[PDB]
Amino acid sequence: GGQWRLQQGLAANPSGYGPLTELPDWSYADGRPAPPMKG
Amino acid sequence: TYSPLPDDYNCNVELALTSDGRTIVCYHPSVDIPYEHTKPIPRDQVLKTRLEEKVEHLEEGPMIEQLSKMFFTTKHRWYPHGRYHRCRKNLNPPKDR
Amino acid sequence: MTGKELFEMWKIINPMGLLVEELKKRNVSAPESRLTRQSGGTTALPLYFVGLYCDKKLIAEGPGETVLVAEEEAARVALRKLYGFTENRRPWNY
Amino acid sequence: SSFSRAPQQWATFARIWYLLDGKMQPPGKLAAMASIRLQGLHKPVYHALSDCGDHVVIMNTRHIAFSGNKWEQKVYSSHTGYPGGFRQVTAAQLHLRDPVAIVKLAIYGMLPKNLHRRTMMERLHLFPDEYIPEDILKNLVEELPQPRKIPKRLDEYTQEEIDAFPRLWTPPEDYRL
Amino acid sequence: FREVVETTIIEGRITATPKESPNPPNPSGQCPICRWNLKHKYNYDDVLLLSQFIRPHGGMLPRKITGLCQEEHRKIEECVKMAHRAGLLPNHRPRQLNRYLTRWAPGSVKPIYKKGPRWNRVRMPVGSPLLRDNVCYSRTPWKLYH
Amino acid sequence: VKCTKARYLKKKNMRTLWINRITAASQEHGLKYPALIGNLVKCQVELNRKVLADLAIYEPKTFKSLAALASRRRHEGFAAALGDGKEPEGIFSRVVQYH
Amino acid sequence: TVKIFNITDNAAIKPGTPLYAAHFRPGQYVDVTAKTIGKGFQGVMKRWGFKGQPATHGQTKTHRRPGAVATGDIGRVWPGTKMPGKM
Amino acid sequence: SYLPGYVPKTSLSSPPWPEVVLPDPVEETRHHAEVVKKVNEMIVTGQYGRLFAVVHFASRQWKVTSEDLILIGNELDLACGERIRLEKVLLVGADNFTLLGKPLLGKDLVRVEATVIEKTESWPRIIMRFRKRKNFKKKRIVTTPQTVLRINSIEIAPCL
Amino acid sequence: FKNKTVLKKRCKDCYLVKRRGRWYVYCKTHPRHKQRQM
Ligand SMILES: [Mg+2]
Ligand SMILES: [Mg+2]
Ligand SMILES: [Mg+2]
Ligand SMILES: [Zn+2]
Ligand SMILES: [Zn+2]
């Protein structure tokens, strides 16, 4: 669905600048944010 | 009156969107088989009733085509294997769940 | 205890007898076995899905290679459902 | 499902005896859906090493229909390997000799070319007419729908649809017809 | 219509004939197909339309009497031939292999003993290039050659 | 050398197996694989082929819900295409925007 | 020996019955099936009537041998090739 | 009276697929409100057990449940036996209901709790290059780091 | 019959008929004009 994603402006690869690829993967159980990911 | 799929084999799929529109809620309760759709369960005067233990020893051929006819296979599955493969087989395989 | 079945941990002999005892002790009519689904039947590899009903309402279903073992599996499924030891029950809270 | 392990595995990997009908169906479409069911590609648990094929019982194989002129154009070729074993027979000649050979060869061609093909062929059952053996009839589950739609000849149209269809042209009164 | 009896005496008489259906959706058309908005929306299956356009004995009616245009007339003729070969007209007979979409006459084709290479393959004709221009209702066009 | 090139072939073959299983389950629900994948993408559900095949095998009710969602999205797309105007976009055709 | 004869339903005779030579009649026509006289392993000349090779005129150890059994382009021998065996 | 555009019923006068009418938007939004509400009080009461989730983690999508094990192919900069929260939950569900994010669910709606329980390395992997008649032969051994996580709990909250 | 690729009328009585999938020139008064398309 790359063309549809381009039409909506949400890149073409779903691993490109989305919240799905840019939000942190995990955090500590008590609520401390994780150190930022290398990518 | 509109259903995306027929509603009579697995579950009663009802779709919904939340008020914010950010998530989709699916409600799918199981469909139970009706009793009307089911089917009921199927059901020497002087001597012993002696047990009928005959075991005819068919030769390798007719034995193998009997097994092939019984299990809908070919003869190659029933033909034996050599010592090389028999010892190559893992007799203690790993086992998950 | 985490990942084992109820009749893998507690061995029983007559699940149908246990089930009819529980239904008569909680005032439910005796279950009726019916052949809900059937594939094969004349082959060496049949499949029978036997359902246990009370008052024309489904309480259990069980698969098997013969009708008898399918009926016993349905009885075990009914016992698990009545006990709350189903596979989809809420996991233990640690 | 709360089944025990052995009945759950048996239920998941059990075999199904699908039914399929000939009677003006194209042998290629019959072969396509039969080959899918014989490979077990219709199951979500499919794998080539999982032996997940199902039985397919095709009847009315004598009453298949070919699109176009394939009854005369299509040629089945074999070779008995003695010098001069090359035989070529038309689809019509092969059908009048053996009533199930055309559908059998179509399914055999569509099946994957490995060592499981003969086992799937053993699981395939074909019959030329309405007669089916009683054990197979007691095995049968799910007659699958036909691919074609039986284009419905003129004489069995009902009077309601005949006079519901409007007349296109006005003939002259002085024409012999 | 008109018919002729023989008893010698021969005599022609006029029988009742059907007329046009009351209002065509496109009164500006000049062939019946164009008048009733059916230009690319019929096949060999439409035995109602074909049996309207044929003789009682399976023959075709002339263009000057049907009022058709030439392209529509040839399309009806090929549809009628394919329906006759498919056996969809059991009552319009003259004087077992099941078929459909049969283009050529069955007794005038020779078997393909030597199919060519895959760049020069001899294919089997199915359907009609006259009906190539029909409405598709699909995203692969009609495959006229197999 | 076969081990390395079969790492590559392993990834390709697992993807092909997932596609085959999704095609099987969707055809059991009457839907086709391109329709299912494209309409889930249009509904912004970004489940990949591995978990789609996993839900097909182990969780048939959730897979039937997903197939119903994809079929409804396809019907909404067909309705929008035939309407060709400025009708309401559809309940499940709405696009959640991020900024 | 026991031999199977294909008959129609009106020619059925009870099992256990005696049959004699007068079942046939003179001036008749019959077909006779038998196992032929076995000659064991025989060469091409006695088995298939090959011409063989001339005796004198320079020939090396070839007088009863088959010639070429196939052609050069074909990298095998055809099934059903006439070569020595049991006759 | 035939409409100007009427076509007589032939085999391909009409599209082969059946005509499908979608529900009107207002009644459909009301039905959505009823379904979302009733699922929310199912969540409130607790008429569920053994939830599953589909969670995005380390560029992969995992279908996890409670008491689960997953193997991540990299180090995670965490001590062993350490509780963390998986947040990017694409999907959560149970028996009789499931929830779908677009593309991600709410952190107020679902949490996933995992535990770093192992930091190990993979078995040695052979990387070997060979080209014939050119004397081309290269061999390398790698051991990729790995982290075993145990999915402890999946919890949902009434927020629909 | 003579085998031709292009078919010609050599008489007024010559007529073309398509038989067995092939075009033919038949003449009843001059049978030497019989031609078969290839
Ligand atoms: Mg000599
Ligand atoms: Mg010498
Ligand atoms: Mg000598
Ligand atoms: Zn016209
Ligand atoms: Zn002439």
Curated annotation (Swiss-Prot), chain B:
The protein, known as: Large ribosomal subunit protein mL42
Signal peptide: none
Any one GO molecular function term: RNA binding
Positions of disulphide bridges: none
Cellular component annotations (GO), alphabetically ordered: mitochondrial inner membrane; mitochondrial large ribosomal subunit; mitochondrial small ribosomal subunit; mitochondrion; plasma membrane
Family per similarity comment: Belongs to the mitochondrion-specific ribosomal protein mL42 family.
Subunit: Component of the mitochondrial large ribosomal subunit (mt-LSU). Mature mammalian 55S mitochondrial ribosomes consist of a small (28S) and a large (39S) subunit. The 28S small subunit contains a 12S ribosomal RNA (12S mt-rRNA) and 30 different proteins. The 39S large subunit contains a 16S rRNA (16S mt-rRNA), a copy of mitochondrial valine transfer RNA (mt-tRNA(Val)), which plays an integral structural role, and 52 different proteins.
Assigned keywords, A-Z: Mitochondrion, Ribonucleoprotein, Ribosomal protein, Transit peptide
Annotated localization: Mitochondrion
Record lineage: Eukaryota, Metazoa, Chordata, Craniata, Vertebrata
One GO-annotated biological process of the protein: mitochondrial translation
Chief place of localization: mitochondrion
Organism: Homo sapiens
Region of the whole protein represented: 35 to 142 of 142
Coiled coil: none
From Swiss-Prot, chain C:
Family: Belongs to the ribonuclease III family. Mitochondrion-specific ribosomal protein mL44 subfamily.
Mitochondrion keyword on record: yes
Function: Component of the 39S subunit of mitochondrial ribosome. May have a function in the assembly/stability of nascent mitochondrial polypeptides exiting the ribosome.
Positions in coiled-coil regions: none
Bridged cysteine pairs (disulfide): none
Annotated DRBM domain residues: 14-84
GO annotation, biological process: mitochondrial translation; mitochondrial translational elongation; RNA processing
Species classification: Eukaryota, Metazoa, Chordata, Craniata, Vertebrata
Main localization of the protein described in the UniProt heading: mitochondrion
Transmembrane segments: none
Gene Ontology cellular-component terms listed: mitochondrial inner membrane; mitochondrial large ribosomal subunit; mitochondrion; nuclear body; nucleoplasm; nucleus; plasma membrane
Disease: Combined oxidative phosphorylation deficiency 16: An autosomal recessive, mitochondrial disorder characterized by hypertrophic cardiomyopathy, liver steatosis, and decreased levels of mitochondrial complexes I and IV in heart and skeletal muscle.
Location(s), subcellular: Mitochondrion
GO molecular function: double-stranded RNA binding; endonuclease activity; RNA binding
Annotated keywords: Disease variant, Endonuclease, Hydrolase, Mitochondrion, Nuclease, Primary mitochondrial disease, Ribonucleoprotein, Ribosomal protein, RNA-binding, Transit peptide
Protein name listed in UniProt: Large ribosomal subunit protein mL44
Residues of the full protein shown: 223 to 316 of 332
UniProtKB/Swiss-Prot annotation, chain D:
GO molecular function, one term: mRNA binding
Matching CDD domains: Ribosomal_L13
PROSITE patterns: RIBOSOMAL_L13
GO BP annotation list: mitochondrial translation; negative regulation of translation; translation
Keyword Iron-sulfur listed: no
Record's keyword terms, sorted: Acetylation, Mitochondrion, Ribonucleoprotein, Ribosomal protein
Family matches, as SUPFAM superfamilies: Ribosomal protein L13 (SSF52161)
Compartments, as annotated in UniProt: Mitochondrion
Pfam families cross-referenced by the UniProt entry: Ribosomal_L13
GO cellular component, one term: mitochondrial large ribosomal subunit
Modification type N-acetylserine: residues: S1
Record-linked HAMAP family: Ribosomal_uL13 (MF_01366)
Subunit structure, as described in the record: Component of the mitochondrial large ribosomal subunit (mt-LSU). Mature mammalian 55S mitochondrial ribosomes consist of a small (28S) and a large (39S) subunit. The 28S small subunit contains a 12S ribosomal RNA (12S mt-rRNA) and 30 different proteins. The 39S large subunit contains a 16S rRNA (16S mt-rRNA), a copy of mitochondrial valine transfer RNA (mt-tRNA(Val)), which plays an integral structural role, and 52 different proteins. Interacts with OXA1L.
Alphabetized NCBIfam families for the sequence: rplM_bact (TIGR01066)
Family: Belongs to the universal ribosomal protein uL13 family.
Protein name: Large ribosomal subunit protein uL13m
Gene that produces this protein: MRPL13
UniProtKB/Swiss-Prot annotation, chain H:
Signal peptide: none
Keywords for the protein's UniProt record, in alphabetical order: Mitochondrion, Ribonucleoprotein, Ribosomal protein, Transit peptide
Principal location class: mitochondrion
Superkingdom classification of source: Eukaryota
GO biological process: mitochondrial translation
Family: Belongs to the bacterial ribosomal protein bL21 family.
Protein name: Large ribosomal subunit protein bL21m
Organism name: Homo sapiens
Full-sequence portion shown in this chain: 45 to 204 of 205
